[PDB]
Amino acid sequence: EPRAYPFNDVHGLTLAGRYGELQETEPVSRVRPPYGEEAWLVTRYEDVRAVLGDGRFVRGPSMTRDEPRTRPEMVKGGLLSMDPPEHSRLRRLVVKAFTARRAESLRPRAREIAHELVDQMAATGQPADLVAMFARQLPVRVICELLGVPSADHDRFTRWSGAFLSTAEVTAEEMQEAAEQAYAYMGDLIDRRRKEPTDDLVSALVQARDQQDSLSEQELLDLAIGLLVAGYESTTTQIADFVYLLMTRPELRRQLLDRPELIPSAVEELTRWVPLGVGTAFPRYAVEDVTLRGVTIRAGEPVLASTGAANRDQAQFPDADRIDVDRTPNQHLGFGHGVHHCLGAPLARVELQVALEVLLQRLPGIRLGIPETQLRWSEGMLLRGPLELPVVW
Ligand SMILES: CC[C@H]1OC(=O)/C=C/[C@H](C)[C@@H](O[C@@H]2O[C@H](C)C[C@H](N(C)C)[C@H]2O)[C@@H](C)C[C@@H](C)C(=O)/C=C/C=C/[C@@H]1CO[C@@H]1O[C@H](C)[C@@H](O)[C@@H](OC)[C@H]1OC
Ligand code: HEM
Ligand SMILES: [Cl-]
């Protein structure tokens, strides 16, 4: 009886037709994922939003449960495996340091970084791989700048960070060595910023307070590496997917060339439209029986709340499959919802807006250097995105 899940094909960004069918006829349904427990799948915008904001659906069981998932290993921990009130304390300290103003202040340095990466890419001649040379470089260098990793160390830090991408081809030994290097480096950096604070995020984390509460040494190190892995692969993959869309959809490209002031709205529209996850990814667990659209979800059972499907619900977004760069309103769930809503979103927005702005300004002719049908797509099974994007201009 449960349906085989995921439904999305990883070899492209199409939203599986099953989601729309289920939104009509079985909005709360049973799925059997490749690994982990069978689970409830929730597909309507209203219900996804409700699940992600409902106090009765928690993340703590992630720490021990056989979580519904697409890969054989379990990745657990960090802010996203915590529930209030433990979650609330850590999140309050982080956001006090990691402000929207701090994110906005990184725009000039993100633009300089993007310009340098295009310089480097263009110096390799055509076609050049936009994934290797740009998308996989900008977000980790911006996280370096955000944390306060000195310039001289961005290359080595970027190298270690590459080992944590779901697309990496590294042995267990190599990945272990990269993790050890990164945590040792970050622990040192924290220790130096406590002794001699600067204006960067690591210093602001060390000094964040709520009355007498503060982050411990171990919370600081875990949170800083947490920010890196949460803010790297997502952003990289979304850059790659957004430019893939601009290169393949002439009118979309034309509208942003002709009105670059549309880029921030376009970033929101493409965040809504792109079903970036292969599945849903972070199951919620009922703390008690809950009735959702007439179906009883029993205490303990996992629930997969599809933001990809929710963001394409025709009930919430008029003509939901059209990319309308000027769409208003646009209350999309592509940076989540409820207490776990993306705390890097302000920075992610600056990166994505800068990535489009600079690529379109420097390479307005940018296009696929190979037929679209020949693209190699990631089989990492977490996010959907091209493994390489050969581009010409
Ligand atoms: C696709 C995005 C996620 O990528 C991931 O989930 C990346 C997972 C990769 C695939 C893992 O690496 C693979 O592990 C296998 C055992 C072997 C395989 N090779 C070596 C043969 C190897 O490639 C994991 C275990 C790698 C390590 C370094 C790791 O823990 C990386 C985690 C990255 C998490 C990324 C972001 O998710 C964040 O996960 C946290 C656990 C959450 O708390 C939350 O962060 C705040 C979430 O970001 C919202
Ligand atoms: C295009 C890029 C990004 C997208 C699409 C994205 C999306 C998401 C989503 C959908 C969630 C909620 C996951 C859930 O509740 O299951 C999340 C949480 C999170 N994001 Fe992002 N994110 C992006 C970039 C970033 C960046 C740049 C950072 C750090 C600088 C960041 C840090 C985090 C953290 C720490 C969480 C966990 C929050 C919590 O559990 O309290 N993300 N993000
Ligand atoms: Cl850099």
Coordinates of C-alpha atoms and ligand atoms in Angstrom, one line a residue:
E1 CA 0.0 0.0 0.0
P2 CA 2.5 3.0 0.8
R3 CA 3.9 4.5 -2.4
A4 CA 7.6 4.2 -3.3
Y5 CA 9.2 7.6 -2.4
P6 CA 10.9 10.0 -3.6
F7 CA 8.8 10.8 -6.6
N8 CA 11.1 13.4 -8.1
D9 CA 13.6 12.3 -10.7
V10 CA 17.1 13.6 -9.7
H11 CA 18.0 14.1 -13.4
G12 CA 16.5 17.6 -13.6
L13 CA 14.4 20.0 -11.6
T14 CA 10.8 18.8 -12.7
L15 CA 8.3 18.5 -9.9
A16 CA 6.9 14.9 -10.0
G17 CA 3.2 14.9 -11.2
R18 CA 2.3 12.6 -8.2
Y19 CA 2.6 15.5 -5.8
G20 CA -0.2 17.5 -7.5
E21 CA -2.4 14.3 -7.8
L22 CA -1.9 13.7 -4.0
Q23 CA -2.7 17.3 -3.2
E24 CA -6.1 16.7 -4.8
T25 CA -7.0 13.2 -3.8
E26 CA -4.8 12.1 -0.9
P27 CA -3.2 15.1 0.7
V28 CA -1.9 13.0 3.7
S29 CA -0.6 9.7 2.3
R30 CA 1.8 6.8 3.2
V31 CA 5.3 6.5 1.6
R32 CA 8.1 3.9 1.8
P33 CA 11.4 5.7 1.5
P34 CA 14.7 4.0 0.3
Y35 CA 16.0 3.8 3.8
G36 CA 14.3 4.2 7.3
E37 CA 10.7 3.9 8.4
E38 CA 7.6 4.3 6.3
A39 CA 6.1 7.7 6.9
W40 CA 3.3 10.1 6.2
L41 CA 3.7 12.5 3.3
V42 CA 2.0 16.0 3.5
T43 CA 1.7 17.9 0.3
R44 CA -0.7 20.9 0.4
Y45 CA 0.7 24.3 1.2
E46 CA -1.7 24.8 4.2
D47 CA -0.8 21.4 5.7
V48 CA 3.0 21.7 5.2
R49 CA 2.9 25.2 6.7
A50 CA 0.8 23.8 9.6
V51 CA 3.1 20.8 10.3
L52 CA 6.3 23.0 10.3
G53 CA 4.7 25.5 12.7
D54 CA 2.9 23.1 15.0
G55 CA 4.2 22.5 18.5
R56 CA 3.1 18.9 18.3
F57 CA 5.7 18.0 15.6
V58 CA 9.2 17.7 16.9
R59 CA 12.7 16.9 15.7
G60 CA 14.4 15.3 18.8
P61 CA 13.6 11.7 17.8
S62 CA 15.9 12.2 14.8
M63 CA 18.7 11.5 17.3
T64 CA 17.8 7.8 17.7
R65 CA 15.1 6.9 15.1
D66 CA 15.6 5.0 11.8
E67 CA 14.7 8.2 10.0
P68 CA 12.9 8.0 6.6
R69 CA 15.6 9.1 4.1
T70 CA 17.3 8.7 0.8
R71 CA 20.8 7.7 1.8
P72 CA 22.0 4.7 3.9
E73 CA 23.9 6.7 6.5
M74 CA 22.2 8.9 9.2
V75 CA 23.4 12.5 9.6
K76 CA 22.1 13.7 12.9
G77 CA 22.6 16.6 15.3
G78 CA 22.9 20.4 15.1
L79 CA 20.1 22.9 15.6
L80 CA 17.8 21.0 13.3
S81 CA 17.7 17.9 15.6
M82 CA 16.8 20.1 18.6
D83 CA 13.4 21.1 20.0
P84 CA 12.3 24.0 22.2
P85 CA 13.3 25.0 24.8
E86 CA 16.9 23.7 24.2
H87 CA 16.6 24.8 20.5
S88 CA 15.3 28.2 21.5
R89 CA 18.3 29.1 23.7
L90 CA 20.9 28.2 21.0
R91 CA 18.9 29.8 18.3
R92 CA 18.4 33.1 20.3
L93 CA 22.2 33.4 20.9
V94 CA 23.0 32.7 17.2
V95 CA 20.5 35.2 15.8
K96 CA 21.6 37.9 18.2
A97 CA 25.1 37.6 16.5
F98 CA 24.0 36.6 13.0
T99 CA 21.8 39.6 12.2
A100 CA 20.2 40.7 9.0
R101 CA 22.4 43.7 9.1
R102 CA 25.5 41.5 9.3
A103 CA 24.2 39.5 6.3
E104 CA 23.6 42.7 4.3
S105 CA 27.1 44.1 5.2
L106 CA 28.6 41.1 3.3
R107 CA 27.1 42.2 0.0
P108 CA 30.1 44.3 -1.1
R109 CA 32.7 41.5 -0.3
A110 CA 30.4 38.8 -1.9
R111 CA 30.2 40.9 -5.1
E112 CA 34.1 41.3 -5.1
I113 CA 34.4 37.5 -4.6
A114 CA 31.9 36.8 -7.4
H115 CA 33.8 39.2 -9.8
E116 CA 37.1 37.4 -9.0
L117 CA 35.6 34.0 -9.6
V118 CA 34.2 35.2 -13.0
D119 CA 37.7 36.6 -13.8
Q120 CA 39.2 33.2 -13.0
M121 CA 36.6 31.3 -14.9
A122 CA 36.8 33.4 -18.0
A123 CA 40.7 33.1 -17.9
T124 CA 40.3 29.3 -18.4
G125 CA 38.7 29.8 -21.8
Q126 CA 35.4 28.4 -23.1
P127 CA 33.4 26.3 -22.3
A128 CA 34.1 26.6 -18.6
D129 CA 32.4 24.7 -15.8
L130 CA 30.2 27.2 -13.9
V131 CA 29.7 24.6 -11.0
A132 CA 33.3 23.9 -10.3
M133 CA 34.5 27.5 -10.9
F134 CA 31.7 29.5 -9.5
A135 CA 28.8 27.8 -7.7
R136 CA 31.0 25.6 -5.6
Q137 CA 33.4 28.5 -4.7
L138 CA 31.2 31.6 -3.9
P139 CA 29.2 30.2 -0.9
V140 CA 32.1 28.7 1.0
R141 CA 34.3 31.9 0.5
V142 CA 31.4 34.0 1.7
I143 CA 31.0 31.8 4.9
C144 CA 34.8 32.2 5.4
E145 CA 34.3 36.0 5.2
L146 CA 31.2 35.8 7.5
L147 CA 33.0 33.7 10.2
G148 CA 36.3 35.7 10.0
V149 CA 38.6 33.1 8.4
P150 CA 41.6 35.2 7.3
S151 CA 42.0 35.6 3.5
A152 CA 45.3 33.5 3.4
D153 CA 43.4 30.5 4.7
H154 CA 40.2 30.6 2.5
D155 CA 41.8 28.3 -0.1
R156 CA 42.7 25.5 2.5
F157 CA 39.4 26.0 4.3
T158 CA 37.5 25.7 1.0
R159 CA 39.4 22.5 0.2
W160 CA 38.5 20.9 3.6
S161 CA 34.9 22.1 3.2
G162 CA 34.6 20.4 -0.3
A163 CA 34.9 17.0 1.4
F164 CA 31.6 17.5 3.2
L165 CA 29.5 18.0 -0.1
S166 CA 27.1 15.1 -0.8
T167 CA 28.7 15.1 -4.3
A168 CA 32.3 14.6 -3.0
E169 CA 34.3 11.6 -4.1
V170 CA 36.5 11.2 -1.1
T171 CA 37.5 8.1 0.8
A172 CA 36.5 7.8 4.5
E173 CA 40.1 8.6 5.4
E174 CA 40.2 11.8 3.3
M175 CA 36.8 13.0 4.6
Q176 CA 37.9 12.2 8.2
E177 CA 41.2 14.1 7.8
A178 CA 39.2 17.2 6.2
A179 CA 36.7 17.2 9.2
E180 CA 39.5 17.0 11.8
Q181 CA 41.4 19.8 10.0
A182 CA 38.3 22.0 9.9
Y183 CA 37.2 21.5 13.6
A184 CA 40.8 22.0 14.8
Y185 CA 41.1 25.2 12.7
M186 CA 37.8 26.5 13.8
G187 CA 38.4 25.7 17.5
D188 CA 41.7 27.7 17.3
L189 CA 40.0 30.6 15.5
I190 CA 37.3 30.8 18.3
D191 CA 40.0 30.7 20.9
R192 CA 41.9 33.6 19.2
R193 CA 38.7 35.7 18.7
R194 CA 37.8 35.3 22.5
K195 CA 41.3 36.6 23.4
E196 CA 41.2 39.4 20.8
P197 CA 37.7 40.0 19.3
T198 CA 37.2 41.5 15.9
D199 CA 34.1 42.5 13.9
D200 CA 33.4 39.0 12.4
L201 CA 30.7 36.4 13.3
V202 CA 32.9 34.2 15.4
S203 CA 33.7 37.1 17.7
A204 CA 30.0 38.1 17.9
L205 CA 29.1 34.5 18.8
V206 CA 31.7 34.4 21.5
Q207 CA 30.3 37.5 23.1
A208 CA 26.7 37.0 22.6
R209 CA 24.8 36.9 25.9
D210 CA 21.4 36.6 27.3
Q211 CA 21.7 37.9 30.8
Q212 CA 24.0 35.3 32.2
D213 CA 23.7 32.7 29.5
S214 CA 26.3 32.4 26.6
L215 CA 27.6 29.7 24.2
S216 CA 30.0 27.1 25.6
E217 CA 33.2 26.3 23.8
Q218 CA 31.7 23.2 22.4
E219 CA 28.4 25.0 21.3
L220 CA 30.6 27.6 19.6
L221 CA 32.6 25.1 17.6
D222 CA 29.5 23.0 16.7
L223 CA 27.5 26.1 15.7
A224 CA 30.3 27.5 13.5
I225 CA 30.8 24.2 11.6
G226 CA 27.0 23.9 11.5
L227 CA 26.7 27.2 9.7
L228 CA 29.3 26.1 7.2
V229 CA 27.7 22.8 6.2
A230 CA 24.1 24.3 6.3
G231 CA 25.2 27.4 4.2
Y232 CA 27.5 25.7 1.7
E233 CA 26.0 22.9 -0.4
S234 CA 22.4 24.5 -0.3
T235 CA 23.5 27.8 -1.6
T236 CA 26.0 26.2 -4.2
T237 CA 23.3 24.0 -5.6
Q238 CA 20.7 26.8 -5.7
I239 CA 23.1 29.0 -7.6
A240 CA 23.7 26.2 -10.1
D241 CA 20.0 25.6 -10.5
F242 CA 19.0 29.3 -10.9
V243 CA 21.6 29.9 -13.6
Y244 CA 20.6 26.6 -15.3
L245 CA 17.1 28.1 -15.5
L246 CA 18.3 31.5 -16.7
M247 CA 20.4 29.8 -19.4
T248 CA 17.6 27.6 -20.7
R249 CA 14.7 30.1 -20.4
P250 CA 15.3 33.0 -22.7
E251 CA 12.6 35.2 -21.5
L252 CA 13.6 34.7 -17.8
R253 CA 17.2 35.8 -18.8
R254 CA 15.9 38.8 -20.8
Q255 CA 13.7 40.1 -18.0
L256 CA 16.7 40.2 -15.5
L257 CA 19.1 41.7 -18.1
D258 CA 16.6 44.4 -18.9
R259 CA 15.5 45.0 -15.3
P260 CA 18.2 44.0 -12.8
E261 CA 16.2 45.6 -10.1
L262 CA 13.9 42.5 -10.4
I263 CA 16.6 40.2 -9.1
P264 CA 15.6 40.1 -5.5
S265 CA 12.0 39.3 -6.4
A266 CA 13.3 36.7 -8.9
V267 CA 15.4 35.1 -6.2
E268 CA 12.2 34.6 -4.0
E269 CA 10.3 33.3 -7.1
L270 CA 13.0 30.8 -8.0
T271 CA 13.4 29.8 -4.3
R272 CA 9.5 29.0 -4.4
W273 CA 9.6 27.4 -7.8
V274 CA 12.7 25.1 -7.6
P275 CA 11.9 21.9 -5.8
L276 CA 15.5 21.7 -4.7
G277 CA 15.2 18.7 -2.4
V278 CA 15.1 15.2 -3.9
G279 CA 12.5 14.4 -1.1
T280 CA 11.6 16.4 1.9
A281 CA 14.7 15.5 4.2
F282 CA 14.0 16.4 7.9
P283 CA 11.0 14.4 9.2
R284 CA 8.9 15.7 12.0
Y285 CA 7.6 13.3 14.7
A286 CA 4.1 13.6 16.2
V287 CA 4.3 14.0 20.0
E288 CA 0.6 12.9 20.3
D289 CA -2.1 11.8 18.0
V290 CA -2.9 14.5 15.5
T291 CA -5.7 14.6 12.9
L292 CA -4.6 16.2 9.7
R293 CA -7.1 16.6 6.8
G294 CA -9.1 13.6 8.4
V295 CA -6.3 11.2 8.8
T296 CA -4.9 10.3 12.2
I297 CA -1.2 10.6 12.6
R298 CA -0.3 8.6 15.7
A299 CA 2.0 9.7 18.5
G300 CA 5.6 8.8 17.4
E301 CA 5.0 8.6 13.7
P302 CA 7.2 10.5 11.3
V303 CA 5.8 13.0 8.8
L304 CA 7.5 14.4 5.7
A305 CA 6.2 17.9 5.0
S306 CA 7.1 18.6 1.3
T307 CA 8.1 22.2 0.8
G308 CA 8.7 21.5 -2.9
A309 CA 5.1 20.4 -3.3
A310 CA 3.7 23.1 -1.0
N311 CA 5.4 25.8 -3.0
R312 CA 3.8 24.6 -6.2
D313 CA 0.2 24.2 -4.7
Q314 CA -2.2 25.9 -7.1
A315 CA -4.4 26.7 -4.1
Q316 CA -1.8 29.0 -2.6
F317 CA 0.0 30.3 -5.7
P318 CA -2.0 31.5 -8.7
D319 CA -0.7 29.6 -11.8
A320 CA 1.9 27.9 -9.5
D321 CA 4.0 26.4 -12.2
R322 CA 4.7 29.7 -13.9
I323 CA 7.9 31.4 -12.9
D324 CA 6.8 35.0 -12.5
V325 CA 9.9 37.0 -11.3
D326 CA 7.6 39.8 -10.1
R327 CA 5.2 37.4 -8.2
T328 CA 3.5 39.1 -5.2
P329 CA 2.5 37.9 -2.6
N330 CA 5.0 35.1 -2.3
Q331 CA 4.9 33.4 1.1
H332 CA 6.9 30.4 0.0
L333 CA 8.3 27.7 2.3
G334 CA 11.6 27.4 0.4
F335 CA 13.6 28.7 3.5
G336 CA 11.3 26.5 5.8
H337 CA 8.8 27.7 8.3
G338 CA 8.3 27.6 12.1
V339 CA 11.1 27.7 14.7
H340 CA 13.7 25.9 12.4
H341 CA 13.1 28.4 9.5
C342 CA 16.5 29.0 7.7
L343 CA 18.6 31.3 9.9
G344 CA 20.9 31.9 7.1
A345 CA 18.2 33.1 4.8
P346 CA 19.2 36.8 4.8
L347 CA 22.7 35.8 3.8
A348 CA 21.6 33.2 1.3
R349 CA 19.4 35.9 -0.4
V350 CA 22.4 38.3 -0.6
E351 CA 24.5 35.5 -2.2
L352 CA 21.9 34.5 -4.7
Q353 CA 21.1 38.0 -5.6
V354 CA 24.9 38.8 -6.0
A355 CA 25.5 35.6 -8.1
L356 CA 22.8 36.6 -10.6
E357 CA 23.6 40.3 -10.6
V358 CA 27.4 39.7 -11.3
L359 CA 27.0 36.8 -13.8
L360 CA 24.4 38.8 -15.8
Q361 CA 26.4 41.9 -15.7
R362 CA 29.7 40.3 -16.7
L363 CA 28.5 37.4 -19.0
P364 CA 25.1 38.6 -20.4
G365 CA 25.5 36.0 -23.2
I366 CA 26.0 33.1 -20.8
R367 CA 24.5 29.9 -22.1
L368 CA 25.0 26.1 -22.1
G369 CA 28.2 25.0 -23.8
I370 CA 26.6 21.5 -24.5
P371 CA 23.1 20.3 -25.3
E372 CA 20.8 20.4 -22.3
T373 CA 20.1 16.7 -22.8
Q374 CA 23.8 15.9 -22.2
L375 CA 23.9 17.5 -18.7
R376 CA 25.1 15.2 -15.9
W377 CA 22.9 15.6 -12.8
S378 CA 23.9 14.9 -9.2
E379 CA 23.0 11.5 -7.7
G380 CA 23.9 12.7 -4.2
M381 CA 20.2 12.0 -3.4
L382 CA 19.8 15.0 -1.0
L383 CA 19.5 18.0 -3.4
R384 CA 18.9 18.2 -7.2
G385 CA 21.4 20.0 -9.3
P386 CA 23.8 19.6 -12.3
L387 CA 27.2 18.0 -11.5
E388 CA 28.9 20.3 -14.2
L389 CA 27.5 23.3 -16.1
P390 CA 29.7 23.9 -19.2
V391 CA 29.0 27.4 -20.2
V392 CA 29.9 29.7 -23.1
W393 CA 29.4 33.5 -23.4
Ligands
LIG1 C1 22.7 18.5 1.6 C2 23.0 19.3 2.8 C3 23.6 18.5 4.0 O1 24.6 17.7 3.5 C4 24.7 16.3 3.9 O2 23.8 15.8 4.6 C5 25.9 15.5 3.4 C6 26.1 14.2 3.7 C7 27.3 13.5 3.1 C8 26.8 12.7 1.9 C9 27.8 12.6 4.2 O3 29.0 12.1 3.6 C10 29.1 10.7 3.2 O4 29.1 9.9 4.3 C11 29.2 8.5 4.1 C12 29.2 7.7 5.4 C13 30.4 8.2 3.2 C14 30.6 9.1 2.0 N1 32.0 8.9 1.4 C15 33.0 9.4 2.4 C16 32.2 7.6 1.0 C17 30.4 10.6 2.3 O5 30.4 11.5 1.2 C18 28.1 13.2 5.6 C19 28.1 12.2 6.7 C20 29.4 14.1 5.6 C21 29.8 14.8 6.9 C22 31.1 15.6 6.8 C23 28.7 15.7 7.4 O6 28.2 15.5 8.5 C24 28.1 16.8 6.5 C25 26.9 17.2 6.7 C26 26.2 18.2 5.8 C27 24.9 18.6 6.0 C28 24.2 19.5 5.0 C29 23.2 20.5 5.6 O7 22.2 19.9 6.4 C30 22.4 20.3 7.7 O8 22.5 19.1 8.4 C31 22.6 19.2 9.8 C32 22.9 17.8 10.4 C33 21.4 20.0 10.4 O9 21.5 20.3 11.8 C34 21.2 21.3 9.7 O10 22.3 22.3 9.9 C35 21.9 23.4 10.8 C36 21.2 21.1 8.1 O11 21.2 22.4 7.5 C37 19.9 23.0 7.5
HEM2 C1 19.9 28.8 -1.1 C2 20.3 28.5 0.1 C3 19.6 28.0 1.3 C4 18.4 27.3 1.3 C5 17.5 27.0 0.1 C6 18.1 27.0 2.7 C7 17.0 26.3 3.2 C8 16.8 26.0 4.5 C9 15.6 25.3 5.0 C10 14.4 24.9 4.0 C11 15.7 25.1 6.3 C12 14.7 24.4 7.3 C13 14.9 22.9 7.2 C14 13.8 22.2 8.0 O1 13.2 22.8 8.8 O2 13.7 21.0 7.8 C15 17.0 25.6 6.7 C16 17.5 25.6 8.0 C17 18.8 26.1 8.4 N1 19.6 26.9 7.5 FE1 19.4 27.2 5.6 N2 19.2 27.4 3.6 C18 20.1 28.0 2.7 C19 21.3 28.7 3.1 C20 21.7 28.8 4.4 C21 22.9 29.5 4.8 C22 23.7 30.4 3.8 C23 23.1 29.3 6.1 C24 24.2 29.8 7.0 C25 24.9 30.9 6.7 C26 22.0 28.4 6.6 C27 21.8 28.0 7.8 C28 20.7 27.2 8.3 C29 20.7 26.7 9.7 C30 21.7 26.7 10.8 C31 19.4 26.0 9.7 C32 18.8 25.2 10.9 C33 17.9 26.2 11.6 C34 17.2 25.6 12.9 O3 17.2 24.4 13.0 O4 16.9 26.4 13.8 N3 21.3 28.2 5.4 N4 17.6 26.2 5.6
CL3 CL 38.0 34.2 -1.2

